[PDB]
Amino acid sequence: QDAASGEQVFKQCLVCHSIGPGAKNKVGPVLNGLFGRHSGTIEGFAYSDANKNSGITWTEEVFREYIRDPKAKIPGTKMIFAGVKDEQKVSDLIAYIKQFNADGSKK
């Protein structure tokens, strides 16, 4: 979707997550290079067993389902957040996050 627009939806996430150059782990783990990565693998982040042992691979479709209702997808997750219900917002959000490489540089 529209990355400029996803940047604004990302503000809800920024409180707990970093993205971009120099991103560091906070309440939540860095989101650089998210798509394609296996859940619970950012080094130095203390993941819940619920996330670490889930066996999830972060594809766009799986991100989509998770973000609408995190607790429904990963019961017991430390990510206590109501989710993003709006379809367009999710599509924008995806566009924004997809811009980043694992190192925080922009594709």
Ligand code: HEC
């Ligand atoms: C604090 C109140 C959070 C907000 C707001 C958002 N996230 Fe989050 N996120 C948070 C925690 C504590 C964790 C770890 C969960 C655990 O159970 O260990 C997470 C995790 C994620 C993940 C999975 C990451 C992985 O490496 O597997 C994703 C994909 C994720 N968070 C995305 C995300 C987005 C897109 C948000 C904005 C809508 C967002 N989170 C908000 C804490 C918090």
